[PDB]
Symmetry: C2
Subunit: 136 residues, 2 copies
Amino acid sequence: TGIGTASADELIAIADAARGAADGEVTSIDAKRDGTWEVQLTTAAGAETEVRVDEALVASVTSTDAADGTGPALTLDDETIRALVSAALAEAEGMITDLDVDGDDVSPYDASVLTSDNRSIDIDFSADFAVVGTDI
Amino acid sequence: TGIGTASADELIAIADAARGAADGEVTSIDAKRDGTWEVQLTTAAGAETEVRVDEALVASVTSTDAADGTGPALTLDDETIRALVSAALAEAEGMITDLDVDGDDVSPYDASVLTSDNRSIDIDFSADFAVVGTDI
Ligand SMILES: [U]
Ligand SMILES: [U]
Ligand SMILES: [U]
Ligand SMILES: [U]
Ligand SMILES: [U]
Ligand SMILES: [U]
Ligand SMILES: [U]
Ligand SMILES: [U]
Ligand SMILES: [Zn+2]
Ligand SMILES: [Zn+2]
Ligand SMILES: [Zn+2]
Ligand SMILES: [Zn+2]
Ligand SMILES: [Zn+2]
Ligand SMILES: [Zn+2]
Ligand SMILES: [Zn+2]
Ligand SMILES: [Zn+2]
Ligand SMILES: [Zn+2]
Ligand SMILES: [Zn+2]
């Protein structure tokens, strides 16, 4: 794939990840061909560790709104995210920026595509994943 | 920046990160302009949570080699990674694939650049960060 990075900041992040999984100072950062990195740490003594370092996602709660006093009928289960992402990218090419199942019940799903133009396209979909609305 | 993704797989990863920080099924995935995502989860009851989701790096130990029976004189401290990454990219443009301070003592530092050509350039540097060697 596109193995490697041009970012000192990323390499430093990868050194830092490894630095907290084992003792010793960093003596090698190496891109494996899957997408992961191997970092070698090395103690004053000469003890070598090898640390795998992967892209992770960390999730922290930001807000909260207790029960108004209805759950959701539909949801962004894995099926549903994959449908919307095709449907949306078919209708307009670019980066997906928003998916929601909030909607207005006859258009239950929404996606926002961002485009080279830096022009946002708010797309509206039927329960059956057909385009029913655009806003460019 | 390049806000968004064309990857259902990434959105599903982001939904999954959030799914494990709070209860409820996912009803919104939204890219914030820093680089993070907000996921809204929603319980059967109607309780909304918002979850921040960031790029993280996770580090797991892979191997180990106890003391042969010398630590490292030099190391890839943050200073040193930033020097090598410029020095290397100056000498040859592309993605950095390896940094090491193993070397042969008169060339204490090494970098590997990967290039559009898919041609690897193994570069060799003095303690003073000058190029002393290439291998194309
Ligand atoms: U390795
Ligand atoms: U990621
Ligand atoms: U909320
Ligand atoms: U949204
Ligand atoms: U938000
Ligand atoms: U990253
Ligand atoms: U090792
Ligand atoms: U290396
Ligand atoms: Zn609130
Ligand atoms: Zn899943
Ligand atoms: Zn489903
Ligand atoms: Zn709608
Ligand atoms: Zn809309
Ligand atoms: Zn071993
Ligand atoms: Zn640091
Ligand atoms: Zn230093
Ligand atoms: Zn060398
Ligand atoms: Zn070399």
